[PDB]
Every structure is written in structure tokens, then in C-alpha cells.
Structure 1
């Protein structure tokens, strides 16, 4: 496991003199990660199997244009606030705020033009790159100027993402990454053969609009119990499930903690996740409908990829029993997530 080297190049150019998007390639002896300055998007992630054969393990696009079309957030950074906010409304310090309803009847993943769709400023580091940007007061309805730094580093088969932010005024913040994974390789048609483990005792059941009911339901006895490794398909079938799209409650301190392990026995790849976040959104790519022009002719059908968005609980801003999501001036937002790749 060696420290990565970093390379850069021009990947594309945003329409309407939007600017130049670059691509940064982080390569170690074990992995190769591709990241672009537009929405700090992870475009490619090559991992080896037992045979040392490297497969790109994330869904994505060969070109920028592909990212710009109507697509479901592929491998980008999501903010100012990940996930849903009931009624696109929340109150901060007695004041009520209103966001875009980009997902009737709610607001999702930061609004119309969220973090995944803006150009970030890159700074190359020794073993990675750091993206920075300023989300000004009012951006997407949110209060306060938010200064954000997304730092991606690579050491061996370990990709570390860290999120730092400073607000000019009290505001909610909840950043994550929406990369879709398929250990059997990006071009596989599904995730059924993946074996999953999520260290969580409780989960958040949701409502008709996909908003947490507010209940912190134990997973025992439920199809939500992923404490012991389970095979995706069997599981989903055994439980008469369509897939998942829920937030699992991590047993956390702010200290680094285990989050999940995914294993693909046929290839032998193992993905392990650690984080400082209070929850993880586990989503099975339920909404993919096979109409997207992916990489290497790949088309993406339902269940072809999964996401593990480490974050603070959805709709936290409106559910007091949830972990605090507000960032006040003077404090610092700072979370880390470790994506450790191995072979089992």
C-alpha cells in the first residue's frame, strides 16, 4: 500500500463559458481514482480482484456531457444538505426558511443547483486533491455563506474523503458522496450477489414521501437487520423487498467508526467503510431504469449499483430527536469517511 501520485488534465468545458473542468487522477499501487472539479465527482474507481485484475467499480460517464444530462447524482458531492427536507422548509433561530421543491412535496439534495452541480476550485496535494468553494448566503434558500473544502486522499487501497466547512451564519450542513458501486464491476447488471453488512441497531422508517416518520426503529426482527452479512438478493426476496433507501443509525461518537462492509466473493473484492458520521444512507439504485448511456457502453438498469452516503440523518433540521445538523459561526464542520478496498 503506497501513497498515491497525482496527475491532472483537462476533462471538459462547461457551456455558456461555464469554465474549464479538470480531471485529477490519484493512483497508488492498489487503486486508481478519477475525480473531476465539477461537483467533486468521482468518475472512475479501479479496484483489483484476486487475479489482480482491475475493474472500474463505479457507475459514471465517459465525458462531461454525460454528467450534465439528467442523471441521478452519480458519484458527486452532495450539499448544502443531503437527502430530504420536509416541505422544503425549516426554521433556524426562530426564522423560517424555504427551499426549492425539486421533489414534490419536498426538497432534495441541496435544491435545484446543489453542490454536485457547481464547479469547485482544485488544489493539488501530495497524495491527493482538495476542492474548495464558497456557497454564498442564500444559495438555494440557505442562510449564510458557507465555505467548504472537500479533500480526497489516497493511501494504498484506502481512499479518504474529508469534509470541512465554515458558516457565516447558523445553517444546516450535511455533506456526503453519492457514488454508485458495483464490486463486480461497473458493467455488471446487478448487485444481487453482493454480500452486505451494516453495523447499525436502528434505522429510520419513512413515510409516503420518504421522510423519516421520526421513529428510531430497531432493526431486530426486521428486513433492516444487516448486522450479520447477508446476500443482497436472497435478502430482498426473503423479505419481499424492492431494495433499500433508508438511513441506518450508526453507533457513533465523532470518533472514526465502522460503517459497513460489502463483499463480492466471485471477484473477492471487499469494500469497508468507516466514518465519523451518525448515519449512512444505504440505497440500492432502485430508481435506475436502464436508460442511461454509461461508460463502456454500459446502460444502467435498476439495481445495478448501490450507494453508501455517510451523513447526518435525513430531515434532522426538523426532527429534534435527531443529531444536530446546524453549523454556527465560530464552530467548524468536519467529517471524514474512509473507503477501504481489499481482497477476501
Structure 2
């Protein structure tokens, strides 16, 4: 597994002279990863099957404009705080803060103009690229100036994403990457034939608005028990589930820990995920309605892709029994997620 080489090129130009967007291509002998400076968006991810055939296993667009249209956060970095915040409101050190209600009745994925929709500054690395941006105080209702660095590196079939941040004032922070995967290749219609395993003992049941109830429910005897590989379609069926969109609680320390494994027997592709995060959002692309103009004439229907957003638990800022989500001045936010690609 070789260390990747990096190439860059102009990808697009933002309207209203918002700036030039570049595309960085990371390539090793095993994988090819494409990333743009707009929202640190992974745009393509090429991985081999058992025949040695490479398919891009990530949903996305061929042109910038694709991302600028109303699309569900494809392959981007999410923040300041990923997922939902009840009532778009939280308090920090006795001060109450209000955010944009971009998802009645809550606030979701950073607001109206979240981290996925801003231009990051890129710095090419020997085997990858680093994006950096300053989220000023008050950005999207959040207190504190947040300095963030998103670093993607590639070595063999392992893609590594690290998140670093520094706040000038206490603020919640929860960064992740919303890539939609499809191991049978981007163009397959569904993920039913995927085999999933999530090393989680508990999960977070949610409410009518999808905010966690506050309960840390055990997965035992439930359809949420993914500790043993299950075929997605069968499972959903056997359990009468429409799909998933839940945070699974990881057996967390801040140490690199196994998160989940996804296998696609027909191609033999395997995706293994490790993280330092306390949880993972496992969302089976339930909201795709097959109206998006994807890559290679691909349209993305419901269930065409799934996400594995490693993160801290949703609404943590309002749920004291949840892992701490506040970043205070002087400390450092630092989380890493490993996307290990392989063949079985």
C-alpha cells in the first residue's frame, strides 16, 4: 500500500465572485480520492473489487454547480455542530444561544450556511491536503471564533480524516463528514445487499422530531443490534424498519476504536471504520427521493447510499448525561476517523 501523491486543478468558480474552487486528487496504488476546497467535500472515491476493477463508491456531482444546488450535504464536512439541536437552542455558561431553525422545529448540521457550504483554504501535503478556515464569533449563532483544520491523508487503502479546532470562547463543536457510500458502486440503486456491523451496545432512541429522547437504550433484542453482521435489506425487513438514522453509542475512550464494518460480497469490497468519536450516525439515505442529477447520469433514489458520521451524540449540548460537547479556550478539539478499504 503506497503513499499517495497529490495533484491539484481548478474545479470551479463561485458565483458573486465567491472565489475559485480547487480539486485535489489523492492517489495511491489502491485508492483514488478527489476533494474540493468547498466544504472539504469528497467528490469521488475510487476503490477496487476482487477483479481489481475500480468503482467510485461515493455519491456526488461532476461539477461544482452540483453541490451548489439543494442537495443533502453530499460528501462534505459538517459543523459547527453536526446533526440536530433541539429548538435551535442551547445555553453555555448560563448564556442562552439561538440558532437558525433550518429543520423545524430544530437546527441541523450547523445552520443555513454550515461548514459544508463555505470555501476552505487548502494546503497541499506530501501525502494529502489540509483545509483550514476561521468560523468567526457569532457565525450561525455560535459564540466564539473557531479556528478549524481538516486534514485528509491517504496511504494505501486507508483514508484518514482529522479534525482540529481552537475556540476563543466556549462553544459546542462536533465535526464530521457526510459522505454517502455505496460499495456496489455509486451507480447502484440500493444498499440492501450490504452487510453491516456496528460495534455498539446502546443506541439513542429519538422523538417525533428526531431528537434523542435522552434514553441510552440497549440494543439487545432490538432491531438496533448490529454487533453481528446483518444484511441490511433482510434486517430492515425482518424488523419492519424503514431504514436507520440513529446515533449508535460507541464504546468510547478517546482512543482509536473500531466503529463499523461494511461488506459487499458481490464485489467483495469492505469498508472498515475506526474513530476517536463517541458515536456514529448511521443513516441509510432515507430522504433521497431520486431527483438528484448525480455523476454519470446516476440519480439517487431512497436507500441508494448510507452515511457513517462519526461524531459526538446529537443534542448533547442539551443532554447533560451525554458526552461533553463544549470546547473551551485553551483546549483543543482533535478527532480522527479512519476509512479503511479492502477486499474480502
Tell me whether the two structures share a fold, i.e. TM-score over 0.5: yes
Partner of 1:255: 255
Instruction: State the Cα distance separating 1:227 from its structure 2 match.
Output: 0.1
1:296 corresponds to 2:296? yes
> What's the secondary structure of 2:159's corresponding residue?
strand
Q: Could you tell me the TM-score, scaled by structure 1's length?
A: 1.00
Instruction: State the Cα distance separating 1:168 from its structure 2 match.
Output: 0.2
Instruction: State the Cα distance separating 1:81 from its structure 2 match.
Output: 0.2
Structure 2: which 5+ runs fail to align? none
> What's the secondary structure of 1:293's corresponding residue?
coil
Instruction: State the Cα distance separating 1:26 from its structure 2 match.
Output: 0.2
Equivalent-residue separation in structure 2 for 1:247 and 1:199 (angstroms):
12
Equivalent-residue separation in structure 1 for 2:203 and 2:229 (angstroms):
17
Equivalent-residue separation in structure 1 for 2:311 and 2:155 (angstroms):
23
Equivalent-residue separation in structure 2 for 1:65 and 1:105 (angstroms):
29
Instruction: State the Cα distance separating 1:271 from its structure 2 match.
Output: 0.1
Write out per-residue CA displacement over residues 26-66 of structure 1, whole angstroms, 9 at most, x where no aligned residue. Answer: 00000000000000000000000000000000000000000
Write out per-residue CA displacement over residues 154-213 of structure 1, whole angstroms, 9 at most, x where no aligned residue. Answer: 000000000000000000000000000000000000000000000000000000000000
Partner of 1:34: 34
RMSD: 0.2
Equivalent-residue separation in structure 2 for 1:255 and 1:291 (angstroms):
40
Instruction: State the Cα distance separating 1:275 from its structure 2 match.
Output: 0.2
Instruction: State the Cα distance separating 1:120 from its structure 2 match.
Output: 0.1
Write out per-residue CA displacement over residues 273-295 of structure 1, whole angstroms, 9 at most, x where no aligned residue. Answer: 00000000000000000000000
Write out per-residue CA displacement over residues 117-157 of structure 1, whole angstroms, 9 at most, x where no aligned residue. Answer: 00000000000000000000000000000000000000000
Write out per-residue CA displacement over residues 58-93 of structure 1, whole angstroms, 9 at most, x where no aligned residue. Answer: 000000000000000000000000000000000000
Equivalent-residue separation in structure 2 for 1:107 and 1:269 (angstroms):
36
Equivalent-residue separation in structure 2 for 1:294 and 1:159 (angstroms):
23
> What's the secondary structure of 2:220's corresponding residue?
coil
> What's the secondary structure of 1:65's corresponding residue?
helix
Partner of 1:140: 140
- The residue correspondences of 1:1-344 to structure 2 (distance < 5 A) are 1-344=1-344
Equivalent-residue separation in structure 2 for 1:126 and 1:287 (angstroms):
38
> What's the secondary structure of 1:154's corresponding residue?
strand
Q: Across the two proteins, how many residue pairs are aligned to each other? A: 344
> What's the secondary structure of 1:292's corresponding residue?
coil
> What's the secondary structure of 1:299's corresponding residue?
coil
Instruction: State the Cα distance separating 1:334 from its structure 2 match.
Output: 0.2
Equivalent-residue separation in structure 2 for 1:122 and 1:259 (angstroms):
29
Runs of 4+ in structure 1 over 2 Å off: none
Write out per-residue CA displacement over residues 246-300 of structure 1, whole angstroms, 9 at most, x where no aligned residue. Answer: 0000001000000000000000000000000000000000000000000000000
Equivalent-residue separation in structure 2 for 1:223 and 1:52 (angstroms):
35
Equivalent-residue separation in structure 2 for 1:144 and 1:287 (angstroms):
33
Instruction: State the Cα distance separating 1:12 from its structure 2 match.
Output: 0.1
Equivalent-residue separation in structure 2 for 1:106 and 1:173 (angstroms):
17
Write out per-residue CA displacement over residues 300-325 of structure 1, whole angstroms, 9 at most, x where no aligned residue. Answer: 00000000000000000000000000
> What's the secondary structure of 2:292's corresponding residue?
strand
Equivalent-residue separation in structure 1 for 2:63 and 2:192 (angstroms):
28
